[PDB]
Design a protein around this ligand. Structure first.
Ligand SMILES: CC(=O)N[C@@H]1[C@@H](O)[C@H](O[C@@H]2O[C@H](CO)[C@@H](O[C@@H]3O[C@H](CO)[C@@H](O)[C@H](O)[C@H]3NC(C)=O)[C@H](O)[C@H]2NC(C)=O)[C@@H](CO)O[C@H]1O
Length: 122
């Protein structure tokens, strides 16, 4: 995956959690479409710098999508006061700018850790 502050192991786990790390296309999720490997929404894509040729094209690329995640965490993680490790990045990914502070994302983290090789992933 693209490099940055999020570890390759963490990205692999999030990728698996979101789509079994496959180009699964889009799904309507809580009001808007989530697409590709990391199930990135359009707002998330805009916030991570609009990488790739387009939102859906980027989302369908494991590299572009992961770069977006890297940029998103670089932009919001520390700002939101998140633990600068997968637990925080994963929660930010699922809940937004302050997702790591939302009780809502506690379940996401616990479910992600049930994935082979992802328990306590950093
Ligand atoms: C991987 C993914 O798509 N995760 C989804 C989250 O992104 C989404 O939370 C929402 O994230 C967007 C994008 O960061 C938030 O919009 C931004 O909010 C900031 C701060 O308030 C604002 O300055 C930006 O302009 C704005 N960006 C845009 C492009 O509109 C939005 O507030 C988040 N929504 C909530 C309710 O927290 C969550 C939504 O549940 O879904 C994940 O799947």
């Amino acid at each position: 995956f693209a490099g940055g502050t999020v570890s390759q192991r963490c990205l692999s786990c999030i990728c698996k959690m979101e789509s079994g790390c496959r180009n699964v296309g889009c799904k309507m999720d809580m009001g808007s479409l989530s697409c590709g490997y990391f199930q990135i929404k359009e707002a998330y894509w805009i916030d991570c710098g609009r990488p790739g040729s387009s939102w859906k094209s980027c989302a369908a690329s494991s590299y572009c999508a992961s770069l977006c995640v890297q940029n998103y965490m670089k932009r919001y993680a520390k700002w939101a006061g998140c633990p600068l490790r997968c637990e925080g990045f994963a929660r930010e990914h699922n809940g937004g700018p302050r997702g790591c502070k939302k009780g809502s994302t506690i379940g996401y983290w616990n479910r992600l850790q049930k994935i082979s090789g992802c328990h306590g992933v950093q």
